[PDB]
Design a protein around this ligand. Structure first.
Ligand SMILES: O=C(O)CNC(=O)c1ncccc1O
Ligand SMILES: [Zn+2]
Length: 440
């Protein structure tokens, strides 16, 4: 049978060294009492103000509410995407940032302080790691520790008892199943501060993090006990070569999971830049509904429609699916999402202008068909993704969420809405374009 090891097992320490060396543990003792106090009060503050929410994610095609409640804190404008869900940062006061309620703002400051400390600890550990490997660059080390977000977790096993059994090693109840972390910079470290409020194998009353080798249930897994204020670090390629899970104890527990999000297509600045690139193809003297395009070159049109999808689905639908929970903690994304929606709306104008050109009496058919081939893939994806998002918004599990967390299918409009140049449902349009492309 599959098995696991804990500190109670004589082989635990040599197995940790042999098969899990890029896992590091810094016990609560190594962290100042002052910092423990601040961070723990910050967790409690965010809980009290109701800032942590179960996420309605998607896994193997199913809509699932995570047992764990979460909140993303981090650099202004940054996002972190996991399980098909793009989380938007509640901003921490990074330098040269401007300005959201007193206690919440203090809490985010605290997690930035914690971020600074864990970053220092991580750099030190990566230096020690390389030196160990020397017995056989500094910019890389710095970048692999440059945490830009933390994903905070909370779970009360007494209130959230509906937990699955760990299936391979007898590790008991899981708060989070076996996984690799998503959307991390390659070989970037993860630092976790773990805060638990107050036999054969691992103690069921105590929280652990479990590790196993990928693809491998023969090598016994490790279960690392996590007491109040213990920290652990996944270094270098550990996240790739191994999987981990979180094993529930009996008491409520928070954690702060500091990460280097791979946010190359995942910041507000990046997506604003994309929108601006798309709108370079629009005559921009005045903001009205008489949208006219500078070029119908296929490459340019394809690009514009791709950007249209990107802002629609990766930004707007993601944001509003989450029911503006952020707004409880911060108004930071309010103006940005209004601006992103206006940019998108102009892009609906653009699509209409391309459709109008395609129908233009004097357009030679060869040019028309070139345009159709340029845009069809994007419009097809737009239709399919609109169906998916609309259903994801209307799913049974979605409809049970409280009113302050209810998914909002947005943008959405009825065919009777004269403010929108095109219908929400593109079935007919896509069908017609396809048929045109096949005309003899
Ligand atoms: O709470 C922990 O100790 C470890 N958390 C995780 O492994 C984790 N991973 C990905 C996304 C959210 C998480 O909470
Ligand atoms: Zn994880």
């Amino acid at each position: 049978r599959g098995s696991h090891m804990t500190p109670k097992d004589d082989e635990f320490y040599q197995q940790w060294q042999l098969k899990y060396p890029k896992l590091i543990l810094r016990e609560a003792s190594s962290v100042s009492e002052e910092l423990h106090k601040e961070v723990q009060e910050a967790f409690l503050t965010l809980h009290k103000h109701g800032c942590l929410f179960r996420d309605l994610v998607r896994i193997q095609g199913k809509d699932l509410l995570t047992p764990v409640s979460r909140i993303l804190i981090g650099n202004p404008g940054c996002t972190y995407k996991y399980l098909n869900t793009r989380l938007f940062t509640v901003p921490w006061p990074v330098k040269g940032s401007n300005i959201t309620e007193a206690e919440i703002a203090a809490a985010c400051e605290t997690f930035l302080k914690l971020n600074d400390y864990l970053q220092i600890e991580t750099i030190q550990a990566l230096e020690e790691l390389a030196a160990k490997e020397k017995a056989n660059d500094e910019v890389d080390i710095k970048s692999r520790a440059a945490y830009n977000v933390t994903l905070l977790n909370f779970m009360d096993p007494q209130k959230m008892p509906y937990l699955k059994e760990e299936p391979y090693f007898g590790m008991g109840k899981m708060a989070v199943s076996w996984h690799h972390d998503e959307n991390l910079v390659d070989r970037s470290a993860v630092a976790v501060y773990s805060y638990s409020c107050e036999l054969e194998g691992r103690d069921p009353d105590i929280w652990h993090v479990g590790f196993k080798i990928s693809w491998d249930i023969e090598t016994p897994g490790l279960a690392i006990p996590l007491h109040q204020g213990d920290c652990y670090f996944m270094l270098d390629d550990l996240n790739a070569t191994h999987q981990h899970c979180v094993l529930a104890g009996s008491q409520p527990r928070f954690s702060s999971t500091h990460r280097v999000a791979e946010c190359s297509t995942g910041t507000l600045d990046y997506i604003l830049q994309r929108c601006q690139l798309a709108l370079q193809n629009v005559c921009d003297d005045v903001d009205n509904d008489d949208v006219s395009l500078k070029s119908f070159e296929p490459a340019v049109l394809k690009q514009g429609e791709e950007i249209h999808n990107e802002v629609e689905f990766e930004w707007l639908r993601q944001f509003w699916f989450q029911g503006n929970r952020y707004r409880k903690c911060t108004d930071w994304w309010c103006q940005p999402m209004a601006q992103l929606e206006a940019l998108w709306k102009k892009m609906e104008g653009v699509t209409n202008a391309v459709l109008h050109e395609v129908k233009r009496e004097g357009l030679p058919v060869e040019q028309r068909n070139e345009i159709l081939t340029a845009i069809l893939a994007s419009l097809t994806a737009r239709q399919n993704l609109r169906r998916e998002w609309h259903a994801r918004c209307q799913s049974r599990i979605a409809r049970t969420l409280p009113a302050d967390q209810k998914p909002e299918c947005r943008p959405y409009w009825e065919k009777d809405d004269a403010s929108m140049p095109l219908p929400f449902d593109l079935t007919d349009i896509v069908s017609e374009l396809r048929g045109q492309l096949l005309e003899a």
